[PDB]
Symmetry: C3
Subunit: 541 residues, 3 copies
């Protein structure tokens, strides 16, 4: 230590000790990780029930659901959706003999864990699970058996032991409803889904941190329970009734693919970036987009317009110019460009949405050894929306053209995607289709915004990179304080939350226009956690 | 079920760790409030936001929205990474009694540098930061976008507890903006003259407002940052009237006022050290290795383009460059530019040559596109090379021509005016400080050779890009009165004098001529009193 | 119609103040960053002693050890292990005149900092340090001199000034024992390690945050000291004796490479992902795997089976088919495939583990200019285990075949890896080799598991992606509360923690089977910090 600091200190005011503290004796307890097998029940929806009844387990928290993924054998393309564990959850319910204590919808549990990288990884996020593997023979192993762990985040984990679920000498039932296996699987037509669906069984195990407490001093607390309201298809409104004490309100959009066969051209697999989705789509198209053939290429529909690339290299599709230059092309062969690989239009001789027009430069070298074109660099304007268009909409009734002018080989490689937690109108939820949000508490306008400033606040306040337009009414510390809520006024009709959105106007000649939307409104109501005590007499009969 | 061993294991006063009394908080109601400002115009843009409402009792979490316009026309254009923070010059929160809290643009950015989410919202995408090209005068270079800048204040530390209370006073939030030149990376082709004339800052301030029923206001303490920028290249800077300081930060900034702010390359959205280097290598390669029918044309007379021998090795003095290109036509030969960029202060002395920084170049010539497709490059190019302004290659100090590149390459040079660059390179990799000496009055307060104060700053703040910082306060904020370095007016200990020893560079290296500026940041303690409106008082 | 009401707060007793707090006056103190040079001692093991003796250093925390890495000159391949700073630490000991206050093993300090990205970076994680650099001339600079910073995390940093180590007018000694330089260096046979080991010296400097406190009010506290027990080689048990008050128990595996020369085929350098390890291995093998030669290739052992690739492109190695197609092959030359690059078999008529059979497609273009094959795309089933096999195990006595059928050029590029902190049986600790864990407190079974649910909990509760099978007993916030421990019953015999694992069964014909294992058990015991007659620690019993 230098002299200047010594002189600065070398009087007597009431000071708080910042260099020592009294190590308070905590409640005498003992934790233990407890694992239990359930009871399976079977629209023949799979339901697992876990009963927790023990004199020693005083309190419990940190629920983790294990799932045994079986060995997948056979032919065809198969892969699991990212975070497979969360995606196979439809509903989680924690109940006692008095009724439901806390419950959540599958998507909401996922939304609550979206900022937890570790919980998402344990759930099932690997190249082993999420890459689309191919089976060549009926006995070939597509996927090896694996175990996934789903962190069932509850309000009891917030402040560890302080927030824990205290079993007041009663039975606790944890009920897990599962989504059909079709929701968690990405497969092609070649894959035998019918056999798989029948043969597949959900193999769960519930784990939790149990606490054996000596002379526990139980006190009443407060809990936030989530409620979900899904609006009418393509309707820009949704209402949450009986709102008396709400801590938060979330608003988001979901696509509805019930009007399609849920088939999509491409899928990136484990690689989940916006660029990864785009690159996978470009790769799938390139095979049919630029062809090196001896004369006019064969195997394409009559509707297809495959033009020979001039010496200039530029092929003009209306106003759009495509520069195609392939090296080491054999003298007997020529370079061809598919000028209408995928096209859409609602009126004859009108605006046409052509996927071939979304390319500006294609360069590569022809391989004599593999009889394939090895593409070097592609200049395109392909977006996340293009990769998110269901194949059905290209060949829909609304289209005046054939639509899908790809080869039968390409069409056979299309994958079924039935992920239950998709948001917006694209796989990455990039496109914001809400131009204005209006929240009304009864007749009075509670909140309005054009830009997603509520989403920006949600992302900041929750340290999340994928948030939703959320209104937070509670800025008080949880567990130690009674949560602040938006309070109702039944007499003035201020007992409901009415959400109204203004959807972005889309072009009728773009296939995304026909993707149906659903408004999702999530409300977190406040409940009081009480512990029933008293004497009851019963007539012996 | 619980096992027998744990059961067997289980008058003393014990604290309840399994239950707590859910305390009734102060009755309040939060609301996200958004306001439009008042624009004022060296004709510097200033946005004023006035906050006053009988129901807005307190506020925190200031977020500034910015409407980036559609950019149309010809040329290369892109935004600097974290565009939102970069366009902020100064933020000032004041009342009728004066300024409550204020910050310089760079300091606000420095405070949010460890916040990934805040940085992303600010504007960090391929859509904004990649250098896009406009082909026709009506072509859209950049689509309109909205960016969100988190104005981190001392009021967010402990949420409602730390929040700024409004004692029936008018709170003004003043945002001074940097010129649009600082947030834009563009080439000569881009019509910046029209862009600068037509561009307008479109701001909107958002904050979390609180309606508090019967608020019980108490006095608090606030840390306000002060910045002192030293004389260009001067290894000294002094902070006067230091009476109660919580911290002191020291860093360096480059100065490019002696250049045209033009640089050869830029990686765009990809911001790693390797990304900067790879972009530079890519830009030089087409001029470095030429496949031509006879001696290549279009280069200055000063250029020394040598034909690559059958051996493949071209010797530039002591440096050997292996150049081997596949599928070269019979009528054409492989050439190496042996002096692409050169610098020297004397005619027969040491030369800094960029071509000598290459050891192996391999590729395949494309007959279809008439260009060389490079496979693998072995080089010793560093982050400093990518950070040299073009002006320094053709400077007066240089005995050589300097820039022996083609007119095509020179036309692709980009103007970079990022206001928050640190050190002498874009990634602030090179540490140019050999010694730090901090004096309080006349006495040496702290002395260091290695950047151990930076290592402590990075550890204690969980940041990967920190500064040489002396922290005097290790006491928890809000709940305690901050610990400070106290002054002695009588003894003369009322100023912080920083003296550095810059590491000396080679005069024959162009980086030597990059001007430096020493930045000293001091955080003074102020008392916040709500008697007769909101007012701050300097602890002395 | 476009107008929407802009109204504020449209949703409106002893109360705790949530909008204001009393700014308590703290203890009068002054911090200072203090740096000290040590005293080097030399089994000739390196030991650095730092004596802290000052009447004004009242308390201290945040220990940071600086290390001056020298300029590395000469020929051969050389690079440092990632996080070089932590890897050179063997043991850290903080002691006073009364004895040891706190101490840690090198690996445990690293384990405690594994979730701290910043601390790991400061330690030495750069392309400059970790990439394997090559020296061409005896005076060529391989590595430039560098300074690394090792954050010696102690229990005194938990609650900053509150948790800080107080110096009761006593001399505090910080002793740092260093691992041999062999442990922190990755080099080939060409590199003169004999001279390097002789010329290398550890150049340390200890830094800490010292606090000069005016009228300090010292109070007794509690400290957790880690204890490590390493089981006998290939022994599935390990016991921790005298367990009286433990806060946690960690169990993990380590490989033992003493039965090998510590040489490995490949190393990715700075790039440390699972894919980076795999890609580096594939790259190293490709040079010998696919050969473009004028007639049968030379330089390989007689044991090697190099087959000419047919016009078909398919080379069949038993039931495995390898598609090899190289472009621009000269007319005087042919394409060859090494069908047994690396092979292992316990019997002559048994299952043979062949690395060449792990490849399905190899495509590239031959360069006439550089006389090399430039590989475009490789389809393989190479895993993290393959990259983790020591070269010695390919040519071991157990193998009835030659094993290593690579060229002398490839074999000369093999690197010595002596990283002291490797876990599991692979470099990334991906493969879980424990099928069952049994923890006993005395003779009674305390905890048993099949799946790694204790590791899943460790990873969740500590927000770490690289955790260990850990049993936590303390769920109470440190420093404010007295830590909750598993208490002993000396009379009943429960005064020891006995761990037992059941290793997952591997195939005898796979070289990984012969990688020897060591069980590591870490126990954190509770000690009382008493400041009567200087600083001293007492074991809670
Ligand atoms: C909402 O929760 C709050 C408490 C109530 O919850 C209670 C009911 O459960 C607690 C739990 C679970 C705790 O772990 C602590 C306390 C309490 C409670 O009382 C403390 N209670 C006191 C007891 C003594 N008084 C007065 C005086 C003598 C100093 C102060 C509080 N100190 C306390 C601590 N800290 C210390 O002693 C030490 C060794 C250091 C403290 C440093 C600073 C000061 C804190 O870091 C500060 C930022 C803190 O306020 C937040 C971490 C948080 O507050 C918020 C708003 O976020 C609390 C956890 C605790 O660790």
């Amino acid at each position: 230590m230098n002299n200047t600091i010594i002189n600065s200190l070398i009087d007597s005011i009431k000071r708080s000790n910042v260099f020592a503290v009294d190590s308070q004796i905590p409640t005498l307890y003992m934790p233990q990780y407890i694992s239990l097998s359930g009871v399976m029940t079977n629209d023949n929806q799979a339901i697992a029930s876990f009963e927790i009844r023990d004199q020693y387990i005083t309190a419990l928290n940190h629920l983790v659901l294990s799932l045994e993924l079986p060995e997948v054998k056979g032919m065809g393309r198969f892969g699991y959706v990212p975070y497979v564990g969360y995606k196979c959850i439809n509903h989680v319910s924690i109940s006692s003999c008095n009724g439901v204590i806390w419950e959540i919808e599958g998507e909401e549990l996922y939304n609550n864990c979206i900022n937890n990288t570790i919980a998402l990884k344990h759930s099932g996020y690997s190249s082993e699970l999420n890459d689309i593997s191919i089976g060549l023979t009926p006995n070939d192993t597509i996927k090896e058996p694996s175990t996934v762990y789903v962190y069932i985040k509850t309000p009891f984990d917030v402040e560890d032991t302080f927030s824990s679920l205290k079993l007041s000498d009663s039975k606790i039932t944890v009920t897990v409803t599962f989504n059909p296996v079709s929701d968690i699987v990405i497969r092609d037509s070649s894959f035998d889904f019918e056999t798989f669906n029948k043969e597949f069984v959900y193999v769960p195990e519930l784990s939790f941190i149990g606490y054996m407490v000596k002379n526990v001093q139980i006190k009443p607390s407060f809990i936030e329970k989530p409620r979900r309201v899904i609006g009418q298809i393509n309707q820009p409104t949704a209402t949450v009734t009986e709102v008396h004490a709400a801590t938060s309100l979330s608003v988001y959009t979901k696509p509805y693919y019930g009007n399609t066969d849920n088939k999509f051209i491409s899928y990136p697999g484990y690689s989940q970036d916006e660029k990864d989705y785009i690159d996978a789509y470009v790769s799938r198209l390139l095979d049919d987009l630029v062809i090196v053939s001896d004369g006019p290429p064969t195997g394409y529909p009559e509707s297809a317009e495959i033009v020979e690339v001039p010496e200039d290299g530029i092929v003009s599709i209306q106003d759009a110019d495509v520069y195609v230059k392939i090296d080491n092309v054999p003298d007997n062969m020529s370079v061809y460009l598919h000028t209408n690989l995928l096209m859409f239009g609602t009126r004859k001789n009108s605006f046409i949405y052509n996927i071939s027009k979304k390319f500006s430069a294609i360069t590569g070298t022809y391989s004599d050894a593999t009889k394939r074109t090895i593409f070097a660099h592609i200049s395109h304007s392909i977006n996340i929306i293009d990769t998110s268009i269901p194949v059905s909409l290209w060949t829909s009734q609304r289209n005046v053209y054939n639509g899908d002018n790809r080869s039968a080989e390409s069409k056979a490689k299309d994958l079924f995607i039935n992920d239950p937690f998709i948001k917006g109108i694209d796989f990455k939820n990039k496109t914001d289709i809400i131009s204005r949000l209006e929240v009304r508490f009864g007749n009075d306008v509670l909140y309005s915004e054009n830009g997603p400033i509520s989403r920006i606040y949600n992302e900041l306040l929750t340290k999340s990179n994928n948030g939703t337009r959320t209104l937070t009414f509670n800025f008080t510390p949880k567990i130690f304080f009674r949560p602040t809520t938006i309070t109702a006024n039944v007499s003035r009709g201020k007992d409901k939350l009415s959400v109204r959105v203004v959807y972005s106007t889309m072009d009728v000649n773009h296939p995304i226009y026909y993707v149906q939307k659903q408004l999702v409104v999530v409300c977190n109501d406040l409940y009081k956690v009480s512990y029933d005590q008293g004497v009851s007499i019963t007539k012996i009969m």
